[PDB]
Structures are given as structure tokens and as C-alpha cells.
Write a protein that binds this ligand. Sequence first.
Ligand SMILES: Cc1ccc(CC(=O)NC[C@@H]2CCCO2)cc1
Ligand SMILES: [Zn+2]
Length: 140
Amino acid sequence: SGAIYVGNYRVVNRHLATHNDWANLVWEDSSRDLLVSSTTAQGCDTIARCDCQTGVYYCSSRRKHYPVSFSKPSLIFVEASEYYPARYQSHLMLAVGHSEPGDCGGILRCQHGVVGIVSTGGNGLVGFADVRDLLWLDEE
Ligand SMILES: Cc1ccc(CC(=O)NC[C@@H]2CCCO2)cc1
Ligand SMILES: [Zn+2]
């Protein structure tokens, strides 16, 4: 579990979105596994606007932050997980690290703020769902 809290927006894994998230929907994309909902209180997070390929992500299934190199956001094939089938997922970055289903929503950060959240795992990779292209997270 986990969420990016930027202005009056909450960014979660679409597959973990709550009834409240859907009741206060701003934007969703199943192909990216992202959903954005509106918040009453403002958020403590800043979004990275950058082409960084090195950062630190939180792994809940290890209680640990791990420094990682990660690929640029691409359309990638992703093997069947407990929360999705084997399928293509867009705007996805892969690093070499540990990711179990429960790890989804853990933050990846670089020197520029929040890059994205955990979304995929298995075979010793961790996929992150980039949010740097979502320019509208920083307005309105
Ligand atoms: C490349 C790219 C893709 C998607 C977005 C999402 C966004 O923030 N757009 C607000 C939504 C979209 C439909 C109407 O309102 C930004 C940039
Ligand atoms: Zn950066």
C-alpha cells in the first residue's frame, strides 16, 4: 500500500483505489495502474520533473529503502500477479530489486522529488509507475 500526496491530489495504484478514491475521481488509466482522487487537506509530497535514472524506493516487504538504477518509462510486458493478469503496462520503469504485491504504492524518489510508485514485481525486478509526465499534478 502507499500514496503520493501532492497538493489536493492522492496518487495510488488503480488496483488499490478505494470506494472514496472512485467517488472523488480526478483521472485514472488501467494501462498505467494509476488513479488520482481529490483530497481536503493539502499534501507534503513534491513531484520530480526530470529524466533521472537513479533514485531510492521504499520496500515494505523488507522495511527498507534501496538505492536503484531504473529504465526510462516504457510500454512493458508484465507476468501475471495476484492483482492483474499477464499484460502490457505503459509508463513503466524497471529496476533490479525486491517487489511483492503488498509493496505497490511505495515511493521511488530522486534528487527532484517523487518519480513514481511501485506497481510490478517478481523475477527480482520492481516496476514503478512513473508520474513525472503527469504535468497537471503540479496545478489546480
Ligand atoms: C502524456 C499524458 C497523458 C495523460 C495525462 C493526464 C492528465 O493529467 N490529464 C487530465 C485528464 C485527462 C483527460 C481529461 O482530464 C497527462 C499527460
Ligand atoms: Zn530527478
